[PDB]
Amino acid sequence: MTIKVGINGFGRIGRIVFRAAQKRSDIEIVAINDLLDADYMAYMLKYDSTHGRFDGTVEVKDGHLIVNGKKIRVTAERDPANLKWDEVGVDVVAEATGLFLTDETARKHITAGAKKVVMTGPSKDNTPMFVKGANFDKYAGQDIVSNASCTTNCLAPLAKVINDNFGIIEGLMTTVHATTATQKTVDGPSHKDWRGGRGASQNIIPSSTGAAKAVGKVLPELNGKLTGMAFRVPTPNVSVVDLTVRLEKAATYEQIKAAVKAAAEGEMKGVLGYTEDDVVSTDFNGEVCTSVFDAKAGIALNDNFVKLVSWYDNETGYSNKVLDLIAHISK
Ligand SMILES: [Cl-]
Ligand SMILES: [Cl-]
Ligand SMILES: [Cl-]
Ligand SMILES: [Cl-]
Ligand code: NA
């Protein structure tokens, strides 16, 4: 009904999740933790290069934050066991620091008073992952879950539809992805990912992403049938997937369009979108759907070998689904 949420990590996702929460009445952010002074969090919230100025009022009082007349407890604990979430009545924690993606590390929020935790990234251990449009129904009361990755949220719903209707024998996917915080402005160090340390604005950078393989986990029926890679390009936000699949049942492109459009207007409304316009990436900046099929962009070699294209706002879509998952596990 009215779920109290605590955000750990006020980075890109933390902040977009925060903004999306203002527009929902069933969820309230009541606390934020990060290694930042309240006055600086206020700044990061008020102004955003990609999504413009915060629609609302934000002031600082007594080292805490006041957003639209509500107190938000601001803390700067490095170790999550000290967060004392129960003091501000937190039901669920959105773990968004990118550092606690295992059960033992995330479990600390529960030790600190929170009832459940939602990792805003794919889990490094086998913490179960949930993707709206793919397997929310599979949630089974676990107290710690993952909302997977932004790319998986784009791919899973589309793949599910395609597979349910025509059967995916095998597929390879590519995502042309926007630049992110892990990259560098100019050629710099990235010991675990050499290419990733190259100047982001000057290059097309190949990168790895198990996101395609991870679909196998949220959609068991596709386990071992998909995999892929990514190219990081110089745009600040919004990415796109290029799924190339081989189908069991023959289907004309017109039939595929109809299948997706049906899903978008029906069962997967709000998750999977459909467009026939001449769109470009900026047209999805701010998009809430996690996957928006681009009918005109895709191409079919034949009734059984097709290349499908779907857009996604890697910050906004995912952030909204984090909230959707929080709401879902709180039923
Ligand atoms: Cl806003
Ligand atoms: Cl999983
Ligand atoms: Cl679902
Ligand atoms: Cl469901
Ligand atoms: Na709210």
Residue numbers in the entry: 1 to 331
Authors' own words:
We provide crystallographic evidence that acP can bind to substrate and co-factor binding sites and that acP-dependent acetylation of key lysine residues of the central metabolic enzymes triosephosphate isomerase (TpiA) and glyceraldehyde-3-phosphate dehydrogenase (GapA) could alter their function. We used a high-throughput peptide array technology to determine if acP-dependent acetylation of susceptible lysines could occur in a non-enzymatic manner and x-ray crystallography to both confirm acP-dependent lysine acetylation of specific proteins and to examine the molecular environment of susceptible lysines. Taken together, these crystallographic results confirm the hypothesis that acP can acetylate lysine residues in the absence of an acetyltransferase. Finally, we propose that acP-dependent acetylation can be both non-enzymatic and specific, with specificity determined by the local three-dimensional (3D) environment that surrounds the substrate lysine residue, as well as by its solvent accessibility and pKa.
The enzyme crystallized with four tetramers in the asymmetric unit and had either NAD+ or pyrophosphate bound in the NAD+-binding site. Not all molecules in the asymmetric unit had the same residues modified or ligands bound (for more information). Front and back views of the protein are shown and NAD+ (shown with sticks) is bound at the active site pocket. Phosphate is present in the non-acetylated form and binds in the same location as the acetyl group of the acetylated residue. The protein with the non-acetylated lysine and phosphate bound is shown in orange, the protein with the acetylated lysine is in teal, oxygen atoms are in red and nitrogens are in blue. Acetylation also could inhibit enzyme activity by interfering with the binding of co-factors, allosteric effectors or protein-protein interactions. Our data suggest that it can inhibit enzymatic activity by acetylating key lysine residues in active sites, allosteric sites, or cofactor-binding sites. One major consequence of overflow metabolism is the conversion of acCoA to acP, accumulation of which would cause acetylation of the glycolytic enzymes that convert carbon to acCoA and thus to acP.
